Design a binder for this molecule. Structure first.
Ligand code: CL
Ligand code: CL
Ligand code: CL
Ligand code: CU
Ligand code: CU
Ligand code: CU
Lengths: 12, 12, 12
């Protein structure tokens, strides 16, 4: 699923 | 891949 | 992510 990390939304 | 569970199709 | 294997591009 999409994840959020360091300001960015990307696939996990 | 897409999976089936409890009547629903969702990513695994 | 997409991966390459045996000439084909598919999800990992
Ligand atoms: Cl973003
Ligand atoms: Cl369904
Ligand atoms: Cl290809
Ligand atoms: Cu996820
Ligand atoms: Cu799958
Ligand atoms: Cu991948």
């Amino acid at each position: 699923s999409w994840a959020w990390h360091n300001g960015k939304w990307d696939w996990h």
